[PDB]
Amino acid sequence: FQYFGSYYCQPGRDVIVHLFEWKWTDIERECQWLADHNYCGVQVSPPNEHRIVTDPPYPWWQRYQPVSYTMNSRSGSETQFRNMVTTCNNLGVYIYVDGVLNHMTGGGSGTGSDGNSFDGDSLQYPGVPYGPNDFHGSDDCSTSDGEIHDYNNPTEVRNCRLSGLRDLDGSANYVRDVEAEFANRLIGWGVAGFRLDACKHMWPGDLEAILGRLNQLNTQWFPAGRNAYIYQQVIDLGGEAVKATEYTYLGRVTEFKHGQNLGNVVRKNNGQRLANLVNFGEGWGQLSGFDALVFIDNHDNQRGHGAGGFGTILTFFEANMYKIATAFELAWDYGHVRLMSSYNWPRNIVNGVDTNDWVGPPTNGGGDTKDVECFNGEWICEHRWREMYNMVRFHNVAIGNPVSNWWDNGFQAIAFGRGNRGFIFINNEDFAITQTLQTGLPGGEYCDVISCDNNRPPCGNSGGACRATVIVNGDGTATFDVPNGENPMIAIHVFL
Ligand SMILES: OC[C@H]1O[C@H](O[C@H]2[C@H](O)[C@@H](O)[C@@H](O[C@H]3[C@H](O)[C@@H](O)[C@@H](O[C@H]4[C@H](O)[C@@H](O)[C@@H](O[C@H]5[C@H](O)[C@@H](O)[C@@H](O[C@H]6[C@H](O)[C@@H](O)[C@@H](O)O[C@@H]6CO)O[C@@H]5CO)O[C@@H]4CO)O[C@@H]3CO)O[C@@H]2CO)[C@H](O)[C@@H](O)[C@@H]1O
Ligand SMILES: OC[C@H]1O[C@H](O[C@H]2[C@H](O)[C@@H](O)[C@@H](O[C@H]3[C@H](O)[C@@H](O)[C@@H](O[C@H]4[C@H](O)[C@@H](O)[C@@H](O)O[C@@H]4CO)O[C@@H]3CO)O[C@@H]2CO)[C@H](O)[C@@H](O)[C@@H]1O
Ligand SMILES: [Ca+2]
Ligand SMILES: [Cl-]
Numbered sequence: 001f002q003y004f005g006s007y008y009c010q011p012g013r014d015v016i017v018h019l020f021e022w023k024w025t026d027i028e029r030e031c032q033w034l035a036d037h038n039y040c041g042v043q044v045s046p047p048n049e050h051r052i053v054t055d056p057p058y059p060w061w062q063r064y065q066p067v068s069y070t071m072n073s074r075s076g077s078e079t080q081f082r083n084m085v086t087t088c089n090n091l092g093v094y095i096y097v098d099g100v101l102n103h104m105t106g107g108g109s110g111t112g113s114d115g116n117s118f119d120g121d122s123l124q125y126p127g128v129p130y131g132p133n134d135f136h137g138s139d140d141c142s143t144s145d146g147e148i149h150d151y152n153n154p155t156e157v158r159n160c161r162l163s164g165l166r167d168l169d170g171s172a173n174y175v176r177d178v179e180a181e182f183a184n185r186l187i188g189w190g191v192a193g194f195r196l197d198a199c200k201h202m203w204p205g206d207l208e209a210i211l212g213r214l215n216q217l218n219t220q221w222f223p224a225g226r227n228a229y230i231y232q233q234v235i236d237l238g239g240e241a242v243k244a245t246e247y248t249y250l251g252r253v254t255e256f257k258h259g260q261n262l263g264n265v266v267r268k269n270n271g272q273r274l275a276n277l278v279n280f281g282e283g284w285g286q287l288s289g290f291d292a293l294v295f296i297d298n299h300d301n302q303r304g305h306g307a308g309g310f311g312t313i314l315t316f317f318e319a320n321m322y323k324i325a326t327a328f329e330l331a332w333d334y335g336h337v338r339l340m341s342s343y344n345w346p347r348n349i350v351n352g353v354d355t356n357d358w359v360g361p362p363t364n365g366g367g368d369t370k371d372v373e374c375f376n377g378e379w380i381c382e383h384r385w386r387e388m389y390n391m392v393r394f395h396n397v398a399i400g401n402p403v404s405n406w407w408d409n410g411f412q413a414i415a416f417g418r419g420n421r422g423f424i425f426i427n428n429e430d431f432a433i434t435q436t437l438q439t440g441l442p443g444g445e446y447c448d449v450i451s452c453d454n455n456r457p458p459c460g461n462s463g464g465a466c467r468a469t470v471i472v473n474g475d476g477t478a479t480f481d482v483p484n485g486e487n488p489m490i491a492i493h494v495f496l
Contacts, residue, residue: 004211004230004251005291007336008192008222009040010092012496014399015330015392016338017383018043020299021060021361024076024084026372031088037389038396041094043195043338047073047081048182049114049127051105058367059358060299063098064197065105065165067112068127069182074113074369085190089221094192096229101179101210102198103165104130120166134175136160136167148201151240158242162201170206180213183228190218193229196251200234200242207232207250231293231336235306238285248291255292255335256307257285259325262296263312266325266428268412274428275408281334294335296325302342303357310349316342316380320486323387324426327450327489330391331416331424333403337395339388342380386463387487390449397493398422405440409433415480417441422493427482436479439492443474446492455493 017034019027019042027042034042049072051065052058063074071078085095109119116127123132141160143149148160161167168175183194199207217226230251236244237256244253261284265272282288300306302315314322329337345359362370362378374381382388401419408414412428415437423439445457448467453460457469470492472478480490 001208001212002227003249004193004214004227005248006227007040007229008094008217008226012396012399013038013040013092014337014396015039016041016043016096016336017341018295018299018338019045019341021045021063021343021369022075022341022372023369024080027075028080028084028087030372031084031091031093033384034088034093035091037392039093039383039392041096041192042088043096043098044084045073045075046098046100046197047071047075047186048100049073049112049116050100051110051118052113052367054367056358058360058363060360061305061358062360064100066100066103067105067118068114068116068125069178069185070114070116070127071185072114074367082189089190089192095190096193096195096231097186097191098197099183099186099194100197101168101170102201103162103167104135105166106164123166128178130168130175130178134169134172136169140169141167151242154241157240158201158203162198167201170202170210176206176209176213180210183210184213184215187215187228188218190221191228192217192222193231196230196232199232199247199253200236204246204250207247211250237307244287244291248287252291252293252336253287254298255287255294256301257287258292258294258329258335259296259298259301259313260307261286262325262329263314266314266321266328267312268428269312273410274412274414274426275410277328277332277414278406278408280332287335289334292335293338294329295338295340296322296329297340298338299340299342302340303345303347304349304352304354305357309352310354315340316382317347322382323385323487324428324489326382326388327391327424327491328426330388330395331398331418331422331491333398333401333418339383339392341383344378344380386453387450390453391491393455394422394424394449394491394493397496405438407435407437409435413482420494422491423478424489424491425480425482426489427484428488430484432481432483434479434481436477438476439472439478440476441472441478441492441494443472443476446470446472446478448490448492450487450489450491455495 053062398418415425417423447459452466
């Protein structure tokens, strides 16, 4: 039985970006920028035919209610999808499909994004086709409303309806065949892998049966005999009967503890200290790095969906702390890193819940999506922020080097290197620090890539606040002058 947790990237590329609700034409155009900045790939929103919800008007979450496995979605047509995949693959930037296999729609009836009808009440999905026999039901789920309530009951979690979403019978050969045909069609077009939605709600044995039906990647671009890359969404913050460790034998698993812990640390919640990150990773009770897909925030928890709440996870709304957490995550050596890329919406937290957590992407009406224009107040484009992409370059130069030359002052300042390739100093204190440290880097003149454009003089001041150059002495020490406040961190590194 094959393992699907290994990704495939061009040399010098590694980090993934979730281009949440981006249209295919925009992702196709973005792949040139992503390749130039040595990102490895893109997670795309569910591309199959999905529900069109008009009350409320065209929420993002309509794409998590499949109507069929045809390929006309809010992000564009099948033609536009295949154009995107071909162009991106040709640039060495790969595509990971948000694959929604646990369920179809909730209740009610309507027309999906490709003109096929559905009826959640009668369990009729003629575009597939699925009927009542293809779903779990009262024989499989004994809760009074048929929905999931008790996360200490694995059978309930896996056989009942997640928030009323009609729950497919993943044990049936027909459903396994239909879902593998969908995945294999995507793979045949050049898709490199999948973010598998709601895997906590599916039996690992059913996922194993589906994955065992997959074809290997398309050799127009990928090496012969290469399994697709599979990472599985399982929210495991402890204290439940379904565990992430149940899924790691199939592929990687989303490590939600990672963003919870880094959010709490950088926020200094309940007396947390940055110095505690000295052993961050598996030693914090998390998955092994090889098993983990890691990220500061995702499309659910930036808007309170999933575990819930707004006092821990860091997002673009907390931009300064968010950059600190992401910089640490990119400079560290733990997990496959995914960066969220968001759109703005009128987040309105009332009694701990965002009342507008349903709002979809920038739109002119009718359920369309507007062309991306980064930094216009509608598209956030975190992956295009200099502090992000320069730390992606830092991360790339550092690939294969362990953490070295760790230093901490005991509280909210840390520093560490990656072999002889890069060094970062993070000052999360409310004061300024002047500290000479062994960097492990060759002597020379370096630029702070958090504030400057380049890694060596001329440093480049496109952001307007490029700091004075950092001198690494012949002995490898450098004196770091890091004021507290905005971007309170200095990162330096060598060239490839
Ligand atoms: O139709 C009848 C039906 O109406 C109501 O339900 C509807 C609901 O109000 C409406 O918002 C929508 O549901 C959305 C959902 O709100 C969105 O979040 C989105 O859900 C997908 C999500 O984006 C995915 O990333 C993925 O995340 C899931 C996890 O896989 C789950 O495990 C679960 O996390 C739980 C976690 O595991 C636990 O440890 C604990 O922390 O609690 C968490 C749950 O709070 O939830 C997350 C986040 O949703 O999977 C989701 C599904 O793909 O998209 C949904 C579909 O559009 O549609 C509902 C159906 O109409 C009403 O509430 C029902 O009672 C009623 O039967
Ligand atoms: O070439 C395009 C642009 O490049 C340069 O802009 C950079 C910035 O120098 C970076 O600092 C960063 O900008 C982020 C910023 O770090 C982040 O804090 C956030 O700022 C928001 C803020 O959250 C919000 O409160 C409010 O004040 O609006 C700010 C943004 O206007 O988001 C910024 C990105 O929008 O990344 C950009 C792009 O790399 C250069 O300075 C620009 O002149 C240039 O157009
Ligand atoms: Ca299920
Ligand atoms: Cl996810």
